[PDB]
Design a protein around this ligand. Structure first.
Ligand SMILES: COCc1nn2c(CN3C[C@@H](CCC(F)(F)F)CC3=O)c(C(F)(F)F)nc2s1
Length: 435
């Protein structure tokens, strides 16, 4: 069967152990995730400078599902290469455009390219990690999203600190420097093999043996008519997506959808309500008598997330994944309640940092759970579907929370708190990755 092969694969991985190969691949996929973080920041904060920049999220969901589904039939390295190439190509194109139409079309296609970054990188990394400590290592890899977010925030604060709302223009230079991480990720990933789990599942056992030999050698330095092809490939992708909701994985997938949607909705609503709330406070304080404030707030908020991820990774395996996920979701809800006490910009930044640092642990734990609960034959399909669900949640939360801006700080707080409470409730029902 396929369960007995998993035990053999885990035995080979454990016998080899961690080493150079895993860390090199860790940095490669870290660059790949840095690209995704950069694009998320760019869409969330830079593109509006109005509401029509959400097209990039709406394309990120499509790309996430498409690349996740394809990665099971074609490969994690090949499909990640294709997706990162699309993202880099269109991010590079965006710089030379001369209007918002072409600019947003290029950003939409680059978002389609980068949508499948997270699913494929997480499945691809988890397929090289032994069960002994893969939670801590996936949590370590989660850091690179924060690195990319802070990188983009710093480059925006340094390059274009002024609004477009009243390579030559500063924003074009910012665009291409933000595209750089994708190019570095592609260049790094071209030097990596293909995950042997995918080869073994497809039937290329000899290629899986070659990949495992490469891993061991690297670690040893330590211690129309023809259109039926596309039609059938899409058919396999659809069949895997439908099997994710089969007699088994239906309850698991529904719980995963609920928790992922709650987390993403809350986070993406709040991180767009925070700079807007601070800016409205500044406006009313100047009335009590240009854009680099948003980028500085984003830089601080995404930088504050990194200590939380340091603590999460070191404690992911010592404590667990259900315990971490629950103790992070309820703490995120509590911090959403605390958001009321942020009655001034000074406190608003501190509460934003607190919320991010508290919440990163639930995302780490849920990554590990979603890669440990789905077999390799549907890991990337389900992960890409849930990433598309998260992007839709991000669009919905951004829209709602930006509609709340300047009216009341209790509606965003209660929306996020209810979302996180429902997410924590559904997370408590998630089965332990063990079963
Ligand atoms: C989109 O849903 C599938 C996944 N997305 N995703 C991410 C990307 N992040 C990090 C989150 C930070 C929340 C807060 F508040 F803690 F900072 C926001 C987001 O989108 C990661 C990680 F970056 F952590 F590696 N892991 C996965 S799975």
């Amino acid at each position: 069967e396929r369960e007995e092969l998993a035990q053999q694969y885990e035995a080979i991985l454990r016998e080899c152990g961690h080493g150079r190969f895993q860390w090199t691949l860790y940095f490669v996929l870290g660059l790949a995730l840095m690209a995704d973080g950069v694009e998320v920041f760019v869409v969330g904060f830079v593109l509006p400078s109005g509401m029509l920049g959400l097209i990039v999220y709406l394309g990120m969901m499509v790309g996430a599902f498409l690349w996740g589904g394809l990665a099971d039939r074609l490969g994690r390295r090949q499909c990640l290469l294709i997706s990162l190439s699309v993202n880099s190509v269109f991010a590079f194109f965006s710089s030379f455009v001369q209007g918002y139409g072409t600019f947003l079309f290029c950003r939409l296609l680059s978002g389609v390219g980068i949508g499948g970054s997270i699913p494929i990188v997480f499945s691809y990394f988890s397929e090289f990690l032994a069960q002994e400590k893969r939670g801590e290592h996936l949590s370590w890899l989660c850091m690179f999203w924060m690195i990319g977010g802070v990188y983009a925030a710093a480059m925006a604060w340094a390059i274009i600190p002024h609004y477009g709302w009243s390579q030559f223009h500063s924003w074009r230079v910012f665009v291409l420097v933000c595209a750089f991480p994708s190019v570095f990720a592609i260049g790094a990933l071209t030097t990596q093999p293909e995950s042997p789990r995918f080869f073994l599942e497809n039937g290329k056992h000899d290629e899986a043996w070659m990949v495992l030999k490469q891993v061991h050698d690297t670690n040893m330095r330590a211690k129309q008519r023809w259109g039926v092809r596309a039609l059938s490939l899409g058919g396999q992708v659809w069949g895997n997506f439908l099997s994710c909701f089969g007699p088994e994985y239906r309850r698991i997938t529904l719980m995963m959808m609920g928790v992922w949607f709650t987390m993403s909705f809350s986070y993406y609503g709040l991180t767009v309500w925070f700079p807007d709330m601070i800016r409205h406070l500044q406006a009313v304080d100047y009335a009590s008598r240009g854009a680099y404030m948003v980028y500085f707030v984003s830089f601080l908020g995404t930088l504050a997330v990194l200590p939380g991820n340091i603590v999460s990774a070191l404690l992911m395996d010592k404590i667990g994944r259900l315990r971490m996920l629950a103790g992070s979701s309820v703490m995120s809800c509590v911090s959403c309640f605390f958001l009321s006490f942020g009655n001034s910009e000074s406190a608003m930044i501190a509460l934003l940092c607190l919320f991010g640092g508290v919440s990163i642990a639930s995302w780490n734990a849920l990554d590990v759970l979603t890669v440990e609960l789905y077999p390799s034959d549907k890991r990337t399909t389900a992960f890409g579907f849930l990433n598309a669900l998260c992007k839709l949640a991000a669009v919905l939360g951004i829209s709602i929370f930006t509609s709340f801006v300047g009216i009341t700080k209790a509606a965003p707080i209660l929306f996020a708190s209810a979302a996180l409470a429902l997410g924590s409730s559904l997370a408590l029902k998630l089965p332990e990755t063990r079963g």
